Assembly symmetry: C3
Homo-oligomer: 335 residues x 3
Amino acid sequence: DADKLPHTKVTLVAPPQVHPHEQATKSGPKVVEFTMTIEEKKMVIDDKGTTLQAMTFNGSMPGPTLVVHEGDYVQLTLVNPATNAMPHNVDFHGATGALGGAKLTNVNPGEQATLRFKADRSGTFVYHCAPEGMVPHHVVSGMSGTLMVLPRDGLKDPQGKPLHYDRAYTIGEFDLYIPKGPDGKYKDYATLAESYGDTVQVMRTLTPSHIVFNGKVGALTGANALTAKVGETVLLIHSQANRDTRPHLIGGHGDWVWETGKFANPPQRDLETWFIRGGSAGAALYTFKQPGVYAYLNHNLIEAFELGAAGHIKVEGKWNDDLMKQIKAPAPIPR
Amino acid sequence: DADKLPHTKVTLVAPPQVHPHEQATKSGPKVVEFTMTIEEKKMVIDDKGTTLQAMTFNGSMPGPTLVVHEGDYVQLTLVNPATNAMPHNVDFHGATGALGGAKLTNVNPGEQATLRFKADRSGTFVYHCAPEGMVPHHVVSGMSGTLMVLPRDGLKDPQGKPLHYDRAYTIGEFDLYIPKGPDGKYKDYATLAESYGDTVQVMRTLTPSHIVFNGKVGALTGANALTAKVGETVLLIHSQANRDTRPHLIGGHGDWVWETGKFANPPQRDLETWFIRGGSAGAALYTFKQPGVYAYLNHNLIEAFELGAAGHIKVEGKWNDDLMKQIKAPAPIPR
Amino acid sequence: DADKLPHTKVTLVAPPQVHPHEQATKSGPKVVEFTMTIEEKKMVIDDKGTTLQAMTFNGSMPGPTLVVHEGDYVQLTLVNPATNAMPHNVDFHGATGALGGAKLTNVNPGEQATLRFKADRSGTFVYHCAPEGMVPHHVVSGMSGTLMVLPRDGLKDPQGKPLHYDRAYTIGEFDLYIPKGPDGKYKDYATLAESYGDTVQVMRTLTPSHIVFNGKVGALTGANALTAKVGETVLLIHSQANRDTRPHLIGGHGDWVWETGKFANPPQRDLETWFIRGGSAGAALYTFKQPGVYAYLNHNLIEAFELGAAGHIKVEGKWNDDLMKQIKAPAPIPR
Ligand SMILES: [Cu+2]
Ligand SMILES: [Cu+2]
Ligand SMILES: [Cu+2]
Ligand SMILES: [Cu+2]
Ligand SMILES: [Cu+2]
Ligand SMILES: [Cu+2]
Ligand SMILES: [Zn+2]
Ligand SMILES: [Zn+2]
Ligand SMILES: [Zn+2]
Ligand SMILES: [Zn+2]
Ligand SMILES: [Zn+2]
Ligand SMILES: [Zn+2]
């Protein structure tokens, strides 16, 4: 009975980081308490100043990743401040009943609610806003993230051997539908509500104007590139709440991948490219063996390079000539 | 030898139901006899009166689901009445040879044919019309359904333990390509043939005008919502003969899912969203644990909510506070 | 250490064939040496004379398939003749480091380079050109193919039993983005560079003008149909470096399929249709049981029949009435 369990309180952190947590644990079930506050805001999503009338959990796209263990109960307080214009709620794909919790968390501006559900299934699961009659708009405008429910004894390979990560990153990929005016330039709207009708018309074409990681073209590049070192295992959590994508690490692999994101199923190994179904989160482990700057991207290369679905991982360490060697550098053809 | 086996005759039923059948059986192989009659007709596919010049097996989209067991022989009589305008045939993905049977079942209006094939592979398999030179048009206009070939000893989990369903529903998802005229309104055609050229032009854009379950926006809602009770296991068969989709049960899961639809392969568990490849049928089991109205939908939320790929399941029973509880209802933020 | 191993030299062959190789081998690791020469050229890609300003490895779309064994080292000399206009490189998804080798193989016209990497993971892997700032254009214009890394002891089923093929075919599927002018006719460009801007505009719509196997509509039909005989097992390697596809054999199955293309993972059996993620290669085995002309195609039937993603396999042998029989040929309906 959940009423008798110890409670713990977790402080969330901004993507692409994930809050401190244990993998395998000796701890018993707990009611794990989180809070998130909705923020509607205009955001610049590309290098030419295009804006999106966005909606977020906790001010970020994606929302922060919440981590618990199988058998825990998630207890979320959702706050919709009076500075917002629209009603919101939350649908946890990790939860059972009431449209994922959406029916129990309808919050108008100035209201808040607290939901509890049992995280009885391991995996990475999408959570997203789903207000009646406005579900697609809230989702594509930025209201999604990941709940990761770890098995109590940690991740396992197909033979039941232990797997682990040394650091975790969370990437949310957002298909955006920004309208254009008669001049062919993207429209800038004074309010969220005014963006609605024109946006729905673009949505219905099924053609995104932009597809971005973590809220903007280039969000995970330059100073904001992800980082690792040779010998470190990274977990890459990838959520796409509305549309399929196909993650790939250039110069690397998915060493162990749960593309449907559910840890009770055996992972696949050695993937070049994996598949995240729209409406899900998946998870890949990779242990770095070579230093350098990798790209992590959606391998529809138009979606990546033209529309924005690509980031970088900068990796320190020693080059390994057994894995790869330039035998002859570029030079004139003989003779 | 099939000539020496006992024959049985099955009466088909209209989707979303599936005809009575056994799962695990003590019965030996049989020649199972079915009949279907093709009906071309204009159908209203949305809430604003848009029509489709449609083509169906047995008067429905999808066609009815045919159920046999591995080792059985399917013997189909296909009838194309003289009231129809076009030639038709049938291609069973469950069958081996002759383009799935299409080469052996070419029936002009006023003709019929009888095909037998051995159902030697377990799974849910698409069947669809495939007349030479007109294959996409016949498929997207409605001529597909599912053949379910059950293992003789019933469904099995990854460890070989028995699985079962207490009721089965069949959902066919149809990407439609309805043309528009200069005024931006959908065109209404007097005959099937007159719809052809304009439809092909829309098809070639790869952008559906509508994506519907079971022939119409809202087909599986209101009085026609699917039904179950807490403690009942439902099988959800999902066919998409032309285009990918990504099924999801809001507030539920795929407890055991064969997304590629082939029962000799281990199922995956705990899925949030699964993937049906265009040209296939898949199958998910779910045991209800909470009462209420669920949505079953394609989790490209634009495809679901804007274009029509969503239905409802109304579930009776007792609410379970351990699985989910509203701890604090929506109320003003403190203080 | 790779420097101490025996070297071997492989002569590549044009798709859809694959160069002679062993499956299970008693041979130890080797440095396997290949050479490929880049050719930019205009190609006719459909039946109405539409041209593509194309770019190829070794003069073909796809490039040839390179076959080695797990533990081998691939040593490629890449040549970019002075008759070409653009810089190129190569990114092997089978390799670890330096953006798949791309950073180490930048070759301007008149240059060549030699890369070595360890093929330490079994599977079919895409290789493709990836020049900085021009990656999508080089890929969609034709610069991709497959590296197949076989396990040293051959392919295995989920229970570890041996699997084999008697012949192998390689199919590359290419989503093309050919621009149109004001008259609605496809544009013909005098040079590769002049095609660039207009092509990028089409790419950004995400709607291919054509989707072809092996460089052209109908490439694998008529005199160029694939061939087999009843009782022969074929391996069908399918690469798609940019966009998802869903292979299907009409009248057949994927008997054993690695849709993510990685041989250390158990294959699935009895597939009707499988899924190749954009940016990957997959592999299916099928043993023919019926003679006749099969179609092998992308089962988005619009993509196949309208846009070009379909080929034929002509199969010799004896018809098997147990698997399929025309019980009653098309004839007038009674009475
Ligand atoms: Cu919202
Ligand atoms: Cu959802
Ligand atoms: Cu037909
Ligand atoms: Cu088919
Ligand atoms: Cu190139
Ligand atoms: Cu790549
Ligand atoms: Zn308590
Ligand atoms: Zn580690
Ligand atoms: Zn008989
Ligand atoms: Zn039951
Ligand atoms: Zn050497
Ligand atoms: Zn053989």
